[PDB]
Amino acid sequence: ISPELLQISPEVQDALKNKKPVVALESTIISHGMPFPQNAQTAIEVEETIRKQGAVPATIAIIGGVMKVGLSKEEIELLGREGHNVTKVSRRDLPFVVAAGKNGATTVASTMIIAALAGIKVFATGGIGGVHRGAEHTFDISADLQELANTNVTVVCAGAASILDLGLTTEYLETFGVPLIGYQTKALPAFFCRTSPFDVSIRLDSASEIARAMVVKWQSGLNGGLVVANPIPEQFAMPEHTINAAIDQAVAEAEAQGVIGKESTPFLLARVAELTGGDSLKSNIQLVFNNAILASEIAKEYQRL
Amino acid sequence: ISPELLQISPEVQDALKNKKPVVALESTIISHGMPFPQNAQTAIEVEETIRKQGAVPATIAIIGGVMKVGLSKEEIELLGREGHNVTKVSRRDLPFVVAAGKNGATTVASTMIIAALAGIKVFATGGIGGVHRGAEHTFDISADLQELANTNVTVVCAGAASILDLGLTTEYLETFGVPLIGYQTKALPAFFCRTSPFDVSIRLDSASEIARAMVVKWQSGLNGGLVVANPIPEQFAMPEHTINAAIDQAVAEAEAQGVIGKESTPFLLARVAELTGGDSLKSNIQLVFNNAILASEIAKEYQRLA
Amino acid sequence: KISPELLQISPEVQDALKNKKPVVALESTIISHGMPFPQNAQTAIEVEETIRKQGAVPATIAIIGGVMKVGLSKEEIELLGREGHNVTKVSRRDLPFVVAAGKNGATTVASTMIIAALAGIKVFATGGIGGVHRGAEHTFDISADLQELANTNVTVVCAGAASILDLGLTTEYLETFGVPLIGYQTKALPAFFCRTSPFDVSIRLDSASEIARAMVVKWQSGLNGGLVVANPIPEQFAMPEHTINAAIDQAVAEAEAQGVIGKESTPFLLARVAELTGGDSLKSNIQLVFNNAILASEIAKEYQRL
Numbered sequence: 053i054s055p056e057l058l059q060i061s062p063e064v065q066d067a068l069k070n071k072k073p074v075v076a077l078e079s080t081i082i083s084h085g086m087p088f089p090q091n092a093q094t095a096i097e098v099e100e101t102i103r104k105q106g107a108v109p110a111t112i113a114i115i116g117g118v119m120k121v122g123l124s125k126e127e128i129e130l131l132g133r134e135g136h137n138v139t140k141v142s143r144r145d146l147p148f149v150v151a152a153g154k155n156g157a158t159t160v161a162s163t164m165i166i167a168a169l170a171g172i173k174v175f176a177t178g179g180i181g182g183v184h185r186g187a188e189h190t191f192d193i194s195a196d197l198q199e200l201a202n203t204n205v206t207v208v209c210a211g212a213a214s215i216l217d218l219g220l221t222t223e224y225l226e227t228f229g230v231p232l233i234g235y236q237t238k239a240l241p242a243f244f245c246r247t248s249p250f251d252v253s254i255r256l257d258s259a260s261e262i263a264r265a266m267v268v269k270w271q272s273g274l275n276g277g278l279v280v281a282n283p284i285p286e287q288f289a290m291p292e293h294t295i296n297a298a299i300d301q302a303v304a305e306a307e308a309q310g311v312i313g314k315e316s317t318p319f320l321l322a323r324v325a326e327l328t329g330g331d332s333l334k335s336n337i338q339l340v341f342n343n344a345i346l347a348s349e350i351a352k353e354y355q356r357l
Numbered sequence: 358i359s360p361e362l363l364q365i366s367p368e369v370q371d372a373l374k375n376k377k378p379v380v381a382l383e384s385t386i387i388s389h390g391m392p393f394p395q396n397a398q399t400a401i402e403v404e405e406t407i408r409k410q411g412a413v414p415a416t417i418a419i420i421g422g423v424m425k426v427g428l429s430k431e432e433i434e435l436l437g438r439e440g441h442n443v444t445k446v447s448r449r450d451l452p453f454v455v456a457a458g459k460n461g462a463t464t465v466a467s468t469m470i471i472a473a474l475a476g477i478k479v480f481a482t483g484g485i486g487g488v489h490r491g492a493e494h495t496f497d498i499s500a501d502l503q504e505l506a507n508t509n510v511t512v513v514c515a516g517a518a519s520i521l522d523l524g525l526t527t528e529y530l531e532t533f534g535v536p537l538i539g540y541q542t543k544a545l546p547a548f549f550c551r552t553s554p555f556d557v558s559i560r561l562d563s564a565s566e567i568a569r570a571m572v573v574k575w576q577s578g579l580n581g582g583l584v585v586a587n588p589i590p591e592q593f594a595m596p597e598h599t600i601n602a603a604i605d606q607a608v609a610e611a612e613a614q615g616v617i618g619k620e621s622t623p624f625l626l627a628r629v630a631e632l633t634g635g636d637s638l639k640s641n642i643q644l645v646f647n648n649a650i651l652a653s654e655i656a657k658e659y660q661r662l663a
Numbered sequence: 664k665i666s667p668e669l670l671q672i673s674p675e676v677q678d679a680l681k682n683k684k685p686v687v688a689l690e691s692t693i694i695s696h697g698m699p700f701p702q703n704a705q706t707a708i709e710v711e712e713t714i715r716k717q718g719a720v721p722a723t724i725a726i727i728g729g730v731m732k733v734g735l736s737k738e739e740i741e742l743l744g745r746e747g748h749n750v751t752k753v754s755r756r757d758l759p760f761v762v763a764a765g766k767n768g769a770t771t772v773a774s775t776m777i778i779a780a781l782a783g784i785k786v787f788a789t790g791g792i793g794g795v796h797r798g799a800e801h802t803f804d805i806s807a808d809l810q811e812l813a814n815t816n817v818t819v820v821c822a823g824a825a826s827i828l829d830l831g832l833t834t835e836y837l838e839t840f841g842v843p844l845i846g847y848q849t850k851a852l853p854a855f856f857c858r859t860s861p862f863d864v865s866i867r868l869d870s871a872s873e874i875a876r877a878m879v880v881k882w883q884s885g886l887n888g889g890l891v892v893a894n895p896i897p898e899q900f901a902m903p904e905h906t907i908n909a910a911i912d913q914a915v916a917e918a919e920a921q922g923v924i925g926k927e928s929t930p931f932l933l934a935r936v937a938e939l940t941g942g943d944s945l946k947s948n949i950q951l952v953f954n955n956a957i958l959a960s961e962i963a964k965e966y967q968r969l
């Protein structure tokens with residue numbers, strides 16, 4: 053509530069009061085999900101994509117201890133340039149970055165929280181956190197899934213990469229009552245891959261259906277979010293053997309180097325990019341754009357209802 | 358909630374207005390838990406069982422996109438005849454069946470949600486969903502358990518069959534703060550069987566004690582449901598070895614055949630029925646009636662206090 | 664507005680809350696099931712006095728004759744101590760039944776957090792929290808304490824937990840559920856008898872003041888749930904690493920061999936470790952409790968200030 057705690061930029065506030073569609077964006081993908089310059093370049097361009105769809109982007113982050121909804125170009129570039137030097141902020145991290153007046157890059161979890169505080173129901177990203185490979189033994193399970201269990205926001209992603217255990221993730225989502233919606237797909241998108249061995253909970257072929265389902269869900273009091281898994285355009289999909297070989301190697305190296313906890317995902321994405329000579333990153337960028345277009349349509353349709 | 362979203366039948370409305378005890382019933386048991394004709398026959402008979410006990414049944418389902426509390430005989434017959442062609446609806450499914458104007462059969466989870474929307478505190482079923490065998494590696498855990506964790510409804514069941522991992526299920530219920538009440542039993546009733554190797558969290562010998570505990574729990578702000586595990590009547594209990602052999606075989610076949618997700622429980626129950634020559638189904642019917650009788654008493658004692 | 668039949672706050676605690684004086688909650692399972700008599704009672708009363716010396720008001724919580732009591736008389740503390748295992752161990756799933764049945768009960772970290780929250784007390788000192796058990800990846804044995812920390816707004820000051828638990832899995836679980844794990848002046852998670860474990864808290868904070876500010880921001884931002892503050896035992900009282908880990912490993916092996924499960928696990932393990940260390944582990948436990956009460960008092964002061 054307090055302006056000391058939370059600030060929405062004039063553009064976003066205008067859109068909100070005047071009821072234009074707003075699409076939220078996270079910052080961990082910037083600071084920890086991609087290298088500089090590509091991170092900031094992509095963040096700025098995803099905002100522009102949203103605007104060209106006739107919606108209003110709101111990139112969320114913690115700036116100087118303030119939860120910020122909508123960011124300046126300079127702030128986005130700050131997060132990008134600072135990179136790993138900025139705190140990665142999940143639900144358990146959030147109060148401390150705010151209290152200490154520091155900068156932080158918000159994960160899907162923290163971005164969902166802040167968007168919900170701002171009354172934004174639609175959030176685009178590249179991929180969600182989830183159940184990690186070996187989590188049956190390690191218990192390494194993203195707080196993103198608990199946020200999806202509880203917070204009312206639709207998250208548009210490409211599913212997630214096979215760095216995660218996608219099967220266990222689909223089971224987990226069912227247990228916690230979270231819809232996993234395939235956009236024009238029955239198969240659950242694998243991020244770099246358009247398909248995977250696993251299926252979504254329901255296939256929906258239009259943004260309008262998704263928006264209507266959101267309305268029914270929250271009107272009926274079923275709190276929690278919705279995952280929309282949107283397959284990467286075929287043109288930008290990684291070759292399967294290449295990408296799965298790269299992922300399997302990165303996971304092995306992560307194990308050997310003792311990479312654990314919040315350091316896992318940043319480490320893995322960076323290493324896969326390295327092993328594919330940048331191709332995986334270019335794919336990530338395209339899937340982010342695609343997700344922002346779909347998210348724009350969902351937000352439009354939702355505002356209309 | 359909009360009339361379009363949620364409709365409570367006049368009988369149930371009057372019952373709630375007039376402070377008469379009401380017992381919710383689910384619909385997944387009808388469409389996916391039992392074959393036709395037995396499915397609709399049982400659903401109608403369980404309603405009558407509740408009325409004979411002096412309570413008012415409310416069967417819950419989604420009909421033409423509307424969440425319905427209390428159903429016509431024709432709607433129940435529909436759910437029974439259509440069977441698997443009706444969508445099985447858990448928490449993650451509910452919004453879409455409603456939005457798309459379709460019919461759906463609600464699981465313990467969805468039925469709890471809807472019952473709670475209507476102010477109904479007592480729900481009779483056959484067996485609850487739970488932790489599946491192998492869940493330590495598959496993560497297959499019923500959304501029913503999360504609903505029990507969070508939604509204010511007492512669910513009367515026979516425990517659950519050993520198609521599930523009952524040990525893991527008892528641990529899960531404890532972690533999530535959910536009472537597992539044995540009605541006149543310390544051993545946890547294993548559906549077809551009156552006992553199992555596992556324990557309920559507390560034994561209570563009267564519906565009155567159960568109702569008192571419900572009132573205290575919710576007046577203390579401890580949100581979430583309660584499981585009442587009620588052993589199948591002695592006449593209908595199945596001999597351990599035959600039934601467990603059938604269950605173990607059905608589980609092994611489901612694993613070999615790659616049966617997963619929401620298809621698992623229906624597959625397992627149908628197969629155990631096939632392997633037992635229909636006996637397991639006859640027992641399932643009887644434990645459902647028994648649960649409706651007890652649930653009727655719990656509802657009566659609960660309404661007495663509230 | 665909870666009924667006085669269910670919940671009673673002692674006049675001293677009521678006055679403290681009304682006068683904005685810092686209050687520090689204390690649990691009772693540690694008394695009945697966590698320590699032997701007389702040591703359990705003596706420690707409970709002494710820790711109250713510690714808190715008084717630090718300028719705060721202690722509130723020990725328990726269920727007495729069916730009433731959730733916030734603040735306890737010396738006699739009630741002595742009763743719980745003397746009765747020991749005859750007093751019911753009360754977690755979230757137990758709570759409604761001991762209250763409804765008018766019985767005595769000793770409240771775990773989970774129940775104590777619940778009642779503290781009902782009273783509006785934000786700071787709770789204890790010895791160690793429940794958590795993920797060794798083998799929980801197979802057994803699913805995970806303390807309801809962790810779900811209470813996920814959801815209920817109370818800071819719990821502890822020594823971490825002993826290696827009877829799986830501390831690694833516990834740190835993962837806390838992350839998934841959004842619960843801050845604060846090391847007090849330490850990055851490494853304290854292991855109860857041990858100052859340091861081969862694990863890292865989520866954040867190190869060096870002062871009560873920082874902790875209180877974080878509490879304020881967390882709850883004003885609407886992130887409901889608790890915070891764990893893991894405070895290393897003073898060096899003077901720490902147990903020798905090899906001796907204590909040998910004792911713990913033996914106790915765990917014996918518990919598994921004897922089929923000790925569920926709510927009986929932790930009390931059995933702590934008792935056995937105390938036996939195997941000839942009482943030294945208990946003396947350590949007592950000292951870490953006192954240390955935690957001191958830090959908790961400072962956090963309570965700073966919180967009330969803010």
Ligand SMILES: O=c1[nH]cc([C@@H]2O[C@H](COP(=O)(O)O)[C@@H](O)[C@H]2O)c(=O)[nH]1
Pocket residue numbers: 078080081082084085086142158159160161178179180181182193194195196213313314315316317321
């Ligand atoms: O392909 C990606 N997946 C996930 C992330 C980020 O990592 C977070 C998950 O991290 P963890 O589960 O450690 O909290 C996501 O919410 C998102 O911010 C990312 O940058 N790129």
Ligand SMILES: O=c1[nH]cc([C@@H]2O[C@H](COP(=O)(O)O)[C@@H](O)[C@H]2O)c(=O)[nH]1
Pocket residue numbers: 383385386387389390391447463464465466483484485486487498499500501518618619620621622626
């Ligand atoms: O003996 C039975 N157990 C469970 C069911 C149904 O199956 C649901 C659990 O399915 P799932 O875990 O797949 O959501 C229960 O809530 C109930 O509706 C049933 O029909 N028969």
Ligand SMILES: O=c1[nH]cc([C@@H]2O[C@H](COP(=O)(O)O)[C@@H](O)[C@H]2O)c(=O)[nH]1
Pocket residue numbers: 690692693694696697698754770771772773790791792793794805806807808825925926927928929933
């Ligand atoms: O060193 C200890 N750890 C934990 C306990 C008690 O055990 C409870 C956890 O037991 P369970 O997980 O079985 O609910 C804690 O909340 C606390 O009351 C204790 O006495 N001593």
Ligand SMILES: [Mn+2]
Pocket residue numbers: 192193194313314316838
């Ligand atoms: Mn993780």
Ligand SMILES: [Mn+2]
Pocket residue numbers: 226497498499618619621
């Ligand atoms: Mn399942």
Ligand SMILES: [Mn+2]
Pocket residue numbers: 804805806925926928
């Ligand atoms: Mn346990």
